[PDB]
Design a protein around this ligand. Sequence first.
Ligand SMILES: NC(=O)c1ccc[n+]([C@@H]2O[C@H](COP(=O)([O-])OP(=O)(O)OC[C@H]3O[C@@H](n4cnc5c(N)ncnc54)[C@H](O)[C@@H]3O)[C@@H](O)[C@H]2O)c1
Ligand SMILES: NC(=O)c1ccc[n+]([C@@H]2O[C@H](COP(=O)([O-])OP(=O)(O)OC[C@H]3O[C@@H](n4cnc5c(N)ncnc54)[C@H](O)[C@@H]3O)[C@@H](O)[C@H]2O)c1
Ligand SMILES: O=C(O)C(=O)Nc1ccccc1
Ligand SMILES: O=C(O)C(=O)Nc1ccccc1
Lengths: 312, 309
Amino acid sequence: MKIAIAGAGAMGSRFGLMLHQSGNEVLLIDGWAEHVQQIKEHGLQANFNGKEVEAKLPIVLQSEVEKEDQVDLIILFTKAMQLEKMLQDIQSLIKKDTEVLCLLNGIGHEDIIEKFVPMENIYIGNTMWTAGLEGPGQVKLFGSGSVELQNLGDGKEAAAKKLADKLSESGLNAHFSDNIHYSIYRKACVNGTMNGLCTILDVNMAELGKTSTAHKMVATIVNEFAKVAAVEKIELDVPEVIAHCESCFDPETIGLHYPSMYQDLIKNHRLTEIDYINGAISRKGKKYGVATPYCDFLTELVHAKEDSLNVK
Amino acid sequence: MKIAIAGAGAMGSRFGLMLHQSGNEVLLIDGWAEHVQQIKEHGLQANFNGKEVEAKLPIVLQSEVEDQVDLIILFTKAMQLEKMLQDIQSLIKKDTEVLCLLNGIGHEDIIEKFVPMENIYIGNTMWTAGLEGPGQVKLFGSGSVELQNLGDGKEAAAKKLADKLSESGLNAHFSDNIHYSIYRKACVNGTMNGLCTILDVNMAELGKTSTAHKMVATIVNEFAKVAAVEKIELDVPEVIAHCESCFDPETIGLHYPSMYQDLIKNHRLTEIDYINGAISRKGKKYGVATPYCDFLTELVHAKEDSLNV
Ligand SMILES: NC(=O)c1ccc[n+]([C@@H]2O[C@H](COP(=O)([O-])OP(=O)(O)OC[C@H]3O[C@@H](n4cnc5c(N)ncnc54)[C@H](O)[C@@H]3O)[C@@H](O)[C@H]2O)c1
Ligand SMILES: NC(=O)c1ccc[n+]([C@@H]2O[C@H](COP(=O)([O-])OP(=O)(O)OC[C@H]3O[C@@H](n4cnc5c(N)ncnc54)[C@H](O)[C@@H]3O)[C@@H](O)[C@H]2O)c1
Ligand SMILES: O=C(O)C(=O)Nc1ccccc1
Ligand SMILES: O=C(O)C(=O)Nc1ccccc1
């Protein structure tokens, strides 16, 4: 099939590369002009599991997408703050039958996606794959991963399973889930603890785990996520989710890495996705009458940090 | 009168120096051996408002005290206060006034283990100081002191003590509501010190951020809820404004708070357990939610652990 990767940064480049290596036709769509020009002239370059790889993937600036152009599957992989503008720029690509899959971190992206895409064509999930964008046209891809996804449209279960199988045929290890909202919240707890705490404390995940108060901070935040999720009839298994968060402390899994939010703000001086993670829990709390002070304070701290570095 | 400065770091050095320049007899007591040695050999050196100054002040290691004084001024960091009181017990006679001007809350409790209640005076100060290295301080700006007796009937003795300090330029005032005053300064220390430390900014930089006001106000409200249980009713709007006045680059805004100097610059443990930590402890005791103070205290301890302090 024809697959467009809308947002061809670290993760988008991974998925595009893997989907291309299995014989899919892949179009990359991106908003970073220098990145697009590099890929045009020299292809996408990857340190892929140690091996230098190059692939000439077609790429277009999101503002230059052709209303004549058309794909079967759009995979969204922008950062949360770029999602709307990306959808505005590529709407003409959204035809009757086009599947649209969102695998961004954070909560609530469906609402935005539903302004541009018919409900029956929306698939959402999250992923445990990782990736790094080293500079224009350059990515570093290590580790293993998985994808979970579910259809949001009534009667699209089989189409969702098919979509997961298709991704799995390119090595993406994708699974259909019958409770994607539970799965999104659970992963959001990980992003809601590791990302902001590492960023503010200036540590990697193993270093965070070594501190005497990490467990208390993680557990308090996870409880706040769970109280908000319960209002939406999602009952998180808090002890399992706390343990799932703390498993990131292990050097043998992902502990030696810095989370994406750290790479964004501390290393690259870019705005973070905090409003969509802890911030989403704060805004829900206010609306539901649930106290979410740690999410409020962590969000505030991260914004302050962004401001202190003069980030956008 | 013979004055001992128990804890002769940045602030203890200021007070000692100013008290000595007015003709008081001053003994410094400290636990930093290298600092004590430097002062013995070369005197205490200060950049004092731009003038290089040297004063040869007697100094003794706290563990080698022997040597009576009339007034002890405590100026350790909070974490060193108990050990300091243990080491200098022999100096605390039925006579001796003991004045605590440390930042933080609740130091009377520990002082009462060593000092009779009628001899305890407490307060806080708006003076500033920097310890640049052993035997070296930098002293700029203006300041003030507020203090009150804790013992019944010691009001006049407290006023006299304030006048004495004022005679050395310390701009000290008696207060009839020292607990209000301690809480109000603790709100400053409970916002600026931890937030600057965690965010790696000076006070003016903190004030320029979009969320500083919200963080300050939430914290101040937690202090006020705890203080109200103890029948202290903070004027929350005025306290918030007093905190935010630190944001002004033309007054104190260009400075890094003491906690920042401690942990980020010098890799030393902080006073967090006696500021935001004291509000958390009280919140547990009174059933009052203090989540910002809990989280800020946790974040600072995690920061300390990450720097292996
Ligand atoms: N990277 C990871 O390991 C990881 C893991 C799981 C989920 N996620 C999630 O996947 C989504 C995408 O993350 P990502 O890491 O691929 O983001 P990314 O920042 O690498 O890319 C996002 C978009 O930003 C653009 N961009 C990147 N750097 C830029 C710069 N300097 N100037 C201009 N544009 C620039 C990219 O070209 C791309 O269009 C996010 O929601 C993220 O949280 C990421
Ligand atoms: N510095 C300020 O401007 C200021 C302003 C108002 C209140 N305060 C408060 O006054 C109290 C004392 O503060 P300070 O600034 O004078 O503390 P300080 O850290 O300058 O000195 C306190 C004690 O620690 C010792 N010390 C300092 N560095 C050391 C080292 N490297 N190794 C071993 N020992 C060392 C000092 O000799 C001193 O005895 C605190 O409660 C503080 O919060 C300080
Ligand atoms: O950093 C991120 O944004 C992210 O999702 N990291 C992550 C990936 C897989 C497992 C755990 C955390
Ligand atoms: O840094 C400190 O510990 C401190 O108390 N600073 C401060 C001084 C004077 C006025 C306001 C704050």
